[PDB]
Design an enzyme around this catalytic site. Structure first.
Site, short mmCIF file in Angstrom:
data_model
loop_
_atom_site.label_atom_id
_atom_site.label_comp_id
_atom_site.label_asym_id
_atom_site.label_seq_id
_atom_site.Cartn_x
_atom_site.Cartn_y
_atom_site.Cartn_z
N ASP A 148 -2.73 3.08 -40.24
CA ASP A 148 -3.08 1.84 -39.56
C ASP A 148 -4.24 1.10 -40.22
OD1 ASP A 148 -2.06 4.02 -37.70
OD2 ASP A 148 -1.63 2.25 -36.48
N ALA A 149 -4.35 1.18 -41.55
CA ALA A 149 -5.34 0.41 -42.28
C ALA A 149 -4.65 -0.74 -43.01
CB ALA A 149 -6.09 1.29 -43.28
#
Ligand SMILES: [Mg+2]
Ligand SMILES: [Zn+2]
Ligand SMILES: [Zn+2]
Ligand SMILES: [Zn+2]
Lengths: 1101, 901
Positions: free
Chosen positions: A726-727
């Site tokens: 989730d970056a």
DNA sequence: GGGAAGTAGTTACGCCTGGTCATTAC
RNA sequence: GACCAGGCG
């Protein structure tokens, strides 16, 4: 025919005419017009101990919003002036007092009893009916909807409590016994009473009354109210032969054992055990009068009606036992009523007035007793006027509105208004909260209900323990006010209904209830309900009346009270909707409005009761003969923030919830007057944009005029690790050109307070002599009057306003330095400086600091489909890949995050946004009516690209094309206000708590982190004892204590002669030193505070 | 010189001790005079301590920050009953004679019960059981066996009221109240020879001391006063309570001295008793709690010791520490697993004390010169005496010259230091580990990605704490015991916990799949990027057109494995088991097959490594993933931790490079089924819905045999649910069949990297039935969930069934049903954690003290043997072979392979 | 005596933001 | 310093 695109035109007029904050303004207007007069008329008057004096109350009036200066003058006030000067936006109250001397009324007099806060943009506010340019000239934003108070310069909003029905009867059943409990709540003058009647294994009916511990039997309490003869009880309750047999079984406990006064003796014995014999009768009669069903009255004459009501409740109880009625559901919305501002304010005003009248009585009695009758009767008007202290009302109302602690134990009634952006404020103004306790599970209460359709948003709710217990109103929801009940009752009595007293109910006759109470019977209710609803459609009666019937029990219900939640629908007759194309045309031109459509009978409101009899069709092409109503617009069942998500029916519910909750935190242009507006915190986005894919509701509600967020060119590609879990990865050149740039505000306040006597503060550049004088570097850019020059750079700990306090008594002749300084971890530029005067003459200054913030590592970015993350790496432009058509991605997202969350709406939005940008026209994505996916794919194919949305890209480093086509599009993205610049924190040494000498708490005051108990357990599990010793003792409080070895008490060390001795026992050689934590010494001292004596036994090593 | 506490004993303070240890008597019910100085004789007297700066405690000199405080006492006018010992006084009173002081027992019983108390005294439950029998048997006797005297029953009413029932006549009796001045005299006469029978101790616990006569006053430091900026004083609750007590006592004393009717003193006595009872405990049963001026109930001595903010669980068990930092985290795969990135802002704030020696004088002297503002530098220096000096711009050039052996310097953090890394909540023991520092310019903590699973961290807004040990012993303990590479194996199940995650599996599959081939430049670049020490490329495998050499993925991957490894198994990608059987047969017949024969029969479902060469199979979650990894498990148990760390770093970086440049993406066309699949799904749904109306009508016309469990309706519901579940599974089967391995989502799901088949069948086929608490939706209107359905409907679609996919959209009714179903997950995740944490708290508070002795036995602190051998074989679960004590077949196979070759 | 029935004790860990207090009659 | 309300993992 009528297509769904035509009903949208009709639906628009509802919001265009009514608004979005009606449930506050209407309730406050109703309270202003009638609540005050009713509250005043409740008391009647004052009865002092003067031999021949009495005062009767008259009328009450509300004046213009004004403020009184301390020197005497009174001048008009405006909301921005109140906000800046930290004042209270209130208006005075006036009351007429009629003196009565020897039983003869005199000429009336008028006195001011206090001040009342004013709801913004109400029927009495100064901003009512003004034009847009008038609001602009006054510093107000025309988009401001109003509906909140201004208390001491802060903005307060009253949420709505979801209470239970106020007089209904609800039956249930518990498994711990066979009890068939039926409980009611009775309301009279703000007093809530709980009354329950039930049976048990004995088969005898029992009654529970407040202040009566013992459950007195049913016949005993019935005979206390009269009608002692055994025929009367059975006639009062029912006539079913099985009920007759049950009642004959019940009577034998009291049929031939007691009379009317004997039951009074029993009740007196219970309520007053072992007291005076005469005391018992009066106590029992008082309890019977004003504790048993108070909503029927407290006069002794109403006892027959009370007995009838109790008999009806017992009849319901016994009908549950034989299975003639299913148990009631508490979560059904027909049993719940909302509490608005107009009733909470009523209760608060009631309690304040109750205090004020007693204070006035005491003052008048004391003044007459002291000065004598001649002074009182010399000038009666002056005597009445000068005996009123108009502060007990104002202060008590204002403190309750400010703190948020309502009388009666309730908490959280008033909350601070959330002003992050437009959506946050608009959603906060439409909250609904439950009074249950948060900690308990409450499995039944937190679940969704079928009756919530069209009244409560199903997706917007908090995420923590507050889930389910806090909800938001839908868009079609309409709250109702109250009409007078006597007129309704006398109208209902005029079309065939016989009174309950004249005729006894029997199973062949229908029952009729009005607001929960029984009023009579009729021979045919099926025609009666049709007649009443047809009269309502015609326009004879008000539209707040709803009628429903149940043929299983032969009952008819009529409701006319406030607090119900209703939704509008289209009337369908003979399988044909009553709305025609010409009606839509007339609405569009402007000849017809929503209220006229309501009046003509085309559209009617339905609450939870009427919807039982309805059979609603969903789409205009699905109607038939059986249907009775047509849904207006299914897309409007969602709340306000939850309607922002495009294509909301293609996503998982938790992702929609996350997106709806997260839409209230994004940065953007909140309000037009942010420059003048003084707030503790604020934000501003430099280049806001309108979403390319949007719902048509947002245009109508005015969101497009105050947007928040920008459109990014997003490529779904897996980069070199830096965008995993989730970056996200952002381009650098895009940032350098102004993407996602924002500014942060903050306001500081200083006051030149006045002390007891001639002592006072002063604005002044401190001299080097004064105590606490900081370094001369900090007083660098202060003008000689003590104020900082605007537009000057400031660092941490720099001084904004220089103030010197009076000396602190032990230091004599030494002023104390108490200047206001920037927070130790902030940085910015001074923006504006304001000088003004408070409400009591003291000076006041407010300073704002402006700081520019550029995206960096750790900043949180999030779309509206529930995808959130932080920036992982910033990449130079030449290293990013580029499509063969000339497009460079603005953002990179990991493909591993798509399948698990199942947010297909994001891909749909990407395709739609790219198509919209190519075509030069925005794309509609309004819920179930938006453009279908296949049309968008075909249009994209026509425009020249590929229907799958993929393209060919070249690697930015090696310089050759990748092996796979890459999905790429345009997606709306938002920047949250959880920046990393406000979370970094580090401590080495600093201030400590006074009591325990441990590091302080909080980032704001250089506190330290907490080493909780599971961290200690983890350290134990690893086995590092010395690490535990270092972390828990060395880096925390530590001290040396002298211990007497002979007796075990703690020794005493004297500095005057450097001698150490034990006080309790004369020992001076065995004294030893022990190293221990200070908190344990405090624990030993606290144990010795009680009579417990801990004795210490030392040991070597 | 320095002693340690060996034991603690408890008791009750006698009035003599209170009067001796006190330093002053309090008489005046006031705190501060008009000027601000403490009032002499008040509750703030200087003799009890000093807090405000500029004042000296005349009892012990000292200053405002170095005086521990001293006690005081109050002389109560008349005795009162301590609320804590209320019930014990009743138990003692109703089990002893009224006028001689002896117990209600005979000598034989006394001897019999003394012989029983002598043994089993160290225990609690047994000693409590013994006492109850004595009280029960002595309660009944109505005449003293030692002296001839009548006795009367006693009634106790909460909290501190005692009633005596006495007979006015045979049929007329009246109740008499026992005032404390009588209870104390009664209690004073019990001989100490029978005290152990009552459970007391004559030396340090005497019955007459439970009735207070003098009350101690805590010192000033135990109730500090805060001066508000407005000029008004803020005082603790104890001060107010003591003031009230003193005022009441003074009024009672004056009334007693001046003479008064009994009804006056007998009411002031009750008021004083109530005040004292509230002062000791403010939550006593059956008493209105004392209320502050603001309406909040006061906090008192009892409340300071209990709860989640009390002195025990709030300060003693856990306390705030000094050297710590907090910030957000961001991924960084370019550092080794045992390192952490630290912002230069934090590294210049936290300091590590160091002692200057002969081998580090030069570096320390260089650091001191840089001052506190350049990165490598120091903030303080400590001379041998003990003075602390701050480094400044006008002091560095002369302080760096005075530096010599014995000094101490508080320098900045460097690369190589060791810190503690923590994330809350700390669920298990692997939530705290030690990392090596590495300084970075920006302001976020950097964490390697393979370390995420043990922390359970995700980069969406998470934060973590950092702690720095200060003493050399702590640093050594952290360096030896808390290293990251020492915790690869999880102690819960004896399997790897740190390993590949997400892309580390997809890249491996892309690298090691069938048909993968690479050119020279890609091979050289990936090998250089991974960090492998290579100086010569191996022989090419095949030639492209124009004679370009090509290398296979397996050849590249084989360069990371150790030289003598050998293993074989089957991974998740096994579809046809009839092809792995041939490979297993070939391996079984000849223990070392010819590599050509194996390469001819390769298959992606069978992994086989021979002498460090990967001959068949493909990378999957079973290779080096968490809780399934086999190669990592073998490496950590046969070569050491360091080799495992090197292998992990190299394989992660190589897979990341492979996935970065080959390209990996997913799009909207990944859920596009052909027309025939949609037709088959529609027919399946149609028949499933049709075969439910028949059951409904059957139930409507009797003709249905109920299952013996519950009534007919429940059986109908169960049958309907079974039919719907079978329908959903059957519909998902064809969606699985018609999507090939070429699709990226199928690759990403079937290899265990992310997701599962249920997500695929929900996205490309019907969502299926929704339910709450295992039953269909029933909440709503009477007989129907929603207003759009006819009352009394039991159809499939009328109670929760959704026949649409996420791609094809949902109708409003299906949307409402989906929201109703989805609320349950949120509420369950909100509710479960509280009771889970409570159970963990109880378990950790019950099993904390059990060690392992040098004999192999597990012993409680007292010495009781719990287990004569830990487990039942003395094997650490962390060091076990997946629970087993030892893996015999693996050892046999590896030894045979080593020797027979 | 063994059935009520009435006490009595608990209900995850951090962190952040802001706002209010801390008597009054004469 | 204690309370109240709202958020983050
Ligand atoms: Mg997280
Ligand atoms: Zn001693
Ligand atoms: Zn001292
Ligand atoms: Zn005796």
């Amino acid at each position: 025919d009528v297509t769904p695109d035509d009903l949208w035109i009709v639906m628009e007029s509802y919001w265009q005419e009514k608004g979005l904050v009606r449930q506050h303004l209407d309730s406050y207007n109703a309270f202003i017009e009638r609540g005050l007069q009713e509250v005043v008329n409740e008391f009647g008057g004052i009865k002092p101990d003067i031999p021949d004096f009495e005062v009767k109350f008259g009328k009450i009036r509300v004046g213009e919003p004004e403020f009184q200066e301390p020197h005497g003058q009174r001048k008009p006030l405006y909301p921005m002036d109140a906000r800046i000067r930290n004042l209270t936006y209130a208006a005075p109250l006036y009351l007429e007092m009629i003196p009565v001397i020897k039983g003869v009324e005199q000429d009336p007099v008028e006195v001011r009893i206090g001040e009342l806060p004013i709801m913004l943009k109400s029927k009495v506010c100064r901003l009512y009916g003004l034009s847009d340019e008038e609001l602009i000239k006054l510093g107000e934003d025309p988009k401001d909807p109003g509906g909140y108070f201004i208390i001491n310069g802060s903005e307060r909003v009253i949420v709505s409590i979801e209470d239970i029905a106020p007089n209904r009867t609800l039956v249930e059943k518990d498994e711990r016994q066979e009890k068939y409990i039926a409980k009611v709540f009775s309301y009279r003058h703000g007093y809530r009473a709980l009354v329950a009647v039930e049976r048990r294994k004995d088969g005898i009916l029992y009654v529970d009354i407040p202040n009566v511990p013992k459950p007195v039997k049913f016949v005993y309490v019935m005979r206390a109210l009269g009608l002692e003869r055994d025929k009367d009880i059975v006639e009062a309750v029912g006539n079913d032969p099985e009920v007759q047999q049950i009642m004959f079984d019940n009577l034998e406990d009291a049929s031939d054992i007691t009379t009317q006064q004997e039951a009074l003796e029993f009740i007196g014995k219970l309520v007053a055990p072992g007291q005076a014999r005469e005391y018992r009768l009066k106590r029992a009669e008082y309890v019977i009068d004003n504790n048993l069903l108070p909503h029927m009255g407290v006069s002794p004459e109403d006892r027959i009606k009370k007995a009838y009501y109790l008999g009806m409740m017992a009849l319901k109880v016994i009908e549950l036992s034989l299975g003639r009625r299913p148990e009631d559901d508490k979560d059904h919305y027909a049993n719940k009523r909302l509490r608005l501002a107009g009733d909470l304010l009523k209760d608060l005003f009631r309690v304040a007035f109750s205090q004020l009248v007693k204070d006035i009585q005491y003052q008048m009695t004391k003044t007459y007793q002291r000065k004598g009758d001649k002074y009182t009767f010399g000038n009666i008007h002056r005597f009445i006027r000068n005996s009123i202290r108009p502060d007990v009302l104002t202060e008590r109302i204002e403190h309750a509105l400010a703190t948020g602690a309502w009388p009666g134990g309730r908490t959280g009634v008033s909350q601070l208004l959330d002003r992050t952006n437009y959506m946050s404020t608009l959603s906060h103004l439409r909250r609904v909260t439950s009074p249950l306790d948060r900690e308990q599970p409450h499995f039944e209460a937190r679940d969704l209900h079928g009756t919530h359709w069209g009244r409560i948003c199903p997706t917007e709710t908090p995420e923590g323990p507050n889930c389910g217990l806090v909800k938001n109103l839908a868009l079609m929801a309409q709250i109702t006010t109250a009409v007078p009940e006597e007129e309704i009752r006398e109208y209902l009595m005029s079309l065939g209904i016989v009174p309950i007293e004249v005729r006894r109910p029997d199973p062949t006759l229908w029952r009729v209830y009005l607001n929960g109470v029984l009023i009579g019977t009729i021979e045919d209710g099926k025609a009666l309900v049709q007649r009443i609803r047809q009269d309502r459609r015609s326009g004879k009666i008000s539209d707040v009346i709803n009628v429903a019937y149940y043929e299983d029990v032969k009952e008819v219900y009529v409701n006319s009270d406030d607090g119900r939640v209703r939704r509008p629908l289209i009337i369908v007759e003979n399988g044909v909707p009553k709305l025609t194309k010409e009606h839509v045309q007339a609405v569009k031109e402007g000849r017809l409005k929503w209220s006229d459509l309501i009046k003509m009978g085309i559209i009617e409101y339905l609450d939870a009761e009427e919807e039982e009899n309805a059979y609603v069709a969903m789409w205009p092409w699905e109607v038939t003969e059986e249907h009775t109503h047509l849904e207006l617009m299914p897309a409007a069942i969602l709340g306000l923030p939850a309607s922002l998500v495009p294509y909301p029916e293609h996503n998982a519910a938790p992702r929609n919830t996350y997106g709806a909750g997260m839409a209230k935190q994004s940065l953007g242009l909140g309000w037009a007057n942010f420059r003048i507006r003084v707030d503790t915190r604020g934000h501003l986005l430099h280049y806001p944009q309108i979403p390319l894919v949007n719902s048509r509701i947002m245009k109508a509600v005015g969101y497009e005029d105050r947007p928040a967020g920008q459109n990014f060119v997003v490529a779904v590609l897996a980069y070199q690790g830096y965008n995993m879990e989730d970056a996200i990865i952002i381009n650098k050149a895009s940032i350098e050109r102004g993407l996602a740039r924002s500014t942060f505000f903050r306001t500081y306040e200083a006051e030149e307070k006045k002390y007891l006597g001639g002592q006072t503060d002063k604005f002044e550049i401190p001299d080097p002599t004064v105590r606490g004088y900081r370094g001369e570097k900090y007083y660098r850019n202060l003008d000689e009057d003590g104020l900082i020059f605007p537009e000057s750079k400031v660092e941490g700990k720099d001084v904004l306003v220089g103030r010197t306090s009076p000396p602190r008594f032990l230091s004599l002749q030494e002023r104390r330095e108490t200047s206001v300084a920037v927070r130790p971890s902030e940085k910015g530029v001074v923006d504006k400086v304001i000088i003004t005067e408070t409400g009591d003459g003291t000076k006041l200054v407010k300073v704002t600091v402006r700081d520019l913030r550029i995206p960096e590592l750790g900043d949180k970015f999030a779309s509206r489909h529930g995808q959130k993350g932080v920036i992982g790496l910033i990449v130079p432009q030449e290293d990013m890949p580029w499509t063969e058509s000339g497009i460079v991605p603005d953002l990179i997202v990991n493909p591993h995050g798509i399948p698990s969350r199942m947010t297909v709406g994001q891909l749909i939005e990407a395709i739609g946004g790219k198509v919209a940008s190519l075509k030069g026209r925005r794309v509609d994505g309004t819920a179930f009516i938006g453009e279908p996916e296949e049309k968008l794919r075909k249009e994209l194919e026509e425009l020249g690209f590929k229907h799958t949305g993929r393209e060919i890209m070249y690697d930015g480093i090696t310089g050759k094309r990748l092996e796979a086509d890459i999905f790429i599009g345009v997606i709306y993205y938002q920047r949250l206000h959880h920046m990393v610049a406000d979370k970094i924190h580090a401590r080495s040494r600093g201030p400590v708590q006074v009591l325990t000498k441990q590091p302080t708490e909080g980032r704001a005051r250089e506190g330290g982190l907490r080493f909780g108990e599971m961290e200690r357990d983890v350290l134990v599990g690893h086995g590092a004892a010395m690490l535990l010793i270092e972390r828990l003792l060395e880096e925390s409080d530590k001290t040396e204590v002298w211990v007497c070895e002979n007796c075990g008490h703690i020794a005493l060390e004297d500095k005057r002669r450097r001698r150490v001795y034990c006080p309790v026992c004369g020992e001076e050689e065995r004294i030893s030193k022990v190293e221990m934590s200070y908190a344990f010494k405090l624990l030993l001292d606290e144990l010795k505070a009680m009579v417990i004596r801990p004795k210490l036994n030392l040991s070597e090593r | 010189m320095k002693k340690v506490i060996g034991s603690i004993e408890f008791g009750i303070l006698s009035p003599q001790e209170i009067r001796k240890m006190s330093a002053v008597e309090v008489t005046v019910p006031d705190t501060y005079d008009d000027d601000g100085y403490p009032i002499e004789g008040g509750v703030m007297d200087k003799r009890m301590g000093v807090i405000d700066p500029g004042l000296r405690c005349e009892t012990c000199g000292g200053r405002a920050g170095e005086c521990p405080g001293h006690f005081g006492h109050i002389e109560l006018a008349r005795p009162v009953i301590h609320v804590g010992f209320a019930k014990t006084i009743y138990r003692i009173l109703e089990s002893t004679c009224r006028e001689c002081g002896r117990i209600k027992l005979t000598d034989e019983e006394i001897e019999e019960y003394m012989k029983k108390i002598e043994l089993a005294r160290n225990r609690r439950s047994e000693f409590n059981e013994i006492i109850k029998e004595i009280h029960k048997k002595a309660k009944e006797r109505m005449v003293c066996p030692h002296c001839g005297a009548p006795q009367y029953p006693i009634k106790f009413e909460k909290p501190t009221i005692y009633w005596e029932i006495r007979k006015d006549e045979q049929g007329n009796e009246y109740r008499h109240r026992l005032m404390p001045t009588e209870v104390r005299d009664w209690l004073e006469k019990i001989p100490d020879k029978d005290l152990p029978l009552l459970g007391l101790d004559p030396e340090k616990s005497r019955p007459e001391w439970m009735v207070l006569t003098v009350l101690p006053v805590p010192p000033v430091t135990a109730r500090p006063s805060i001066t508000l900026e407005t000029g008004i004083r803020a005082e603790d609750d104890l001060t107010h309570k003591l003031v009230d007590i003193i005022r009441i006592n003074n009024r009672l004393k004056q009334n007693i001295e001046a003479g008064a009717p009994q009804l006056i003193i007998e009411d002031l006595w009750d008021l004083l008793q109530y005040h004292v009872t509230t002062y000791i405990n403010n939550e006593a049963p059956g008493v209105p709690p004392a209320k502050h001026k603001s309406g909040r109930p006061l906090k008192t001595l009892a409340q300071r010791l209990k709860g989640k903010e009390g002195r025990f669980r709030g300060n003693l068990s856990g306390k705030r520490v000094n050297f710590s930092a907090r910030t957000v985290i961001s991924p960084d795969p370019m550092i080794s697993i045992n390192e952490v990135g630290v912002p230069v802002e934090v590294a210049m704030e936290l300091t590590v004390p160091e002692k200057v020696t002969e081998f580090n004088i030069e570096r320390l002297r260089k650091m001191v010169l840089n001052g506190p503002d350049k990165y490598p530098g120091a903030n303080y220096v400590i001379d041998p005496e003990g003075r602390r000096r701050r480094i400044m711009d006008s002091n560095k050039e002369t302080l760096a010259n005075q530096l010599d052996i014995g000094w101490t310097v508080e320098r900045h953090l460097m690369d190589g230091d060791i810190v503690l890394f923590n994330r809350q909540p700390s669920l298990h023991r692997m939530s705290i580990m030690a990392h090596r520092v590495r300084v970075m310019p920006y302001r976020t903590f950097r964490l390697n990605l393979a370390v995420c699973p043990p922390y359970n961290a995700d980069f969406d807004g998470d934060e973590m704490n950092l702690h720095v040990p200060q003493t050399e012993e702590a640093q050594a303990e952290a360096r030896i015991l808390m290293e990251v590479q020492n915790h690869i194996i999880s102690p819960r199940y004896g399997g790897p916990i740190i390993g590949g995650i997400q892309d580390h599996i997809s890249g491996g599959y892309l690298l090691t799949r069938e048909g993968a081939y690479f050119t020279r430049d890609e091979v050289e670049q990936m090998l250089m990027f991974a960090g492998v020490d290579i100086t010569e490329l191996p022989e090419p495998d095949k030639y492209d057109e124009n004679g370009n050499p090509l290398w296979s993925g397996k050849t590249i991957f084989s360069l990371l494995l150790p030289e003598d490894l050998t293993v074989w198994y089957r991974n998740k990608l096994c579809d046809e088991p009839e092809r792995c059987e041939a490979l297993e047969k070939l391996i079984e017949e000849k223990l070392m097959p010819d590599p050509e024969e194996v390469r001819k029969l390769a298959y992606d479902g069978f992994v086989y490594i021979q002498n460090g060469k990967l001959l068949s199979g493909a990378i999957d979650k079973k290779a080096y993933g968490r809780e399934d990894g086999i190669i990592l498990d073998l490496i950590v148990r046969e070569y050491g931790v360091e080799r495992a760390r090197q292998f992990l770093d190299q394989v992660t970086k190589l897979t990341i490079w492979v996935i970065t440049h080959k390209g990996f993406t997913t799009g909207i066309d990944d859920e596009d089924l052909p027309e025939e699949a949609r037709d088959r799904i529609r027919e399946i749904i149609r028949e499933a819905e049709e075969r439910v109306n028949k059951l409904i009508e059957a139930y409507k016309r009797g003709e249905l045999e109920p299952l013996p469990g519950k009534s007919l309706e429940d059986t109908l519901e169960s049958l309907i649910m079974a039919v719907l579940a079978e329908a959903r599974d059957n519909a998902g089967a064809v969606a699985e069949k018609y999507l090939g391995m070429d699709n990226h989502t199928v690759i990403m799901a079937k290899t265990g990297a992310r997701g599962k088949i249920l997500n695929i069948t929900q996205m490309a086929a019907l969502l299926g039935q929704q339910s709450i608490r295992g039953k269909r939706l029933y909440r709503g209107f009477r007989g129907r969930v929603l207003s759009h359905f006819k009352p009394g409907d039991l159809g499939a679609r009328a109670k929760g069934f959704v026949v649409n996919s996420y791609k094809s959209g949902l109708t409003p009714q299906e949307y409402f049903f989906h929201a109703m179903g989805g609320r349950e997950g949120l509420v369950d995740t909100a509710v479960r954690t509280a009771q889970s944490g409570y159970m963990q708290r109880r378990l950790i508070n019950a099993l904390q003290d059990l060690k392992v002795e040098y004999d192999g036995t597990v012993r409680s602190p007292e010495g009781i043997i719990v287990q004569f051998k830990y487990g039942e074989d003395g094997v650490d679960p962390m060091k076990s072979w997946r629970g087993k004590t030892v893996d015999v077949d693996r050892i046999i196979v590896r030894t045979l392979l080593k020797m027979r070759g």
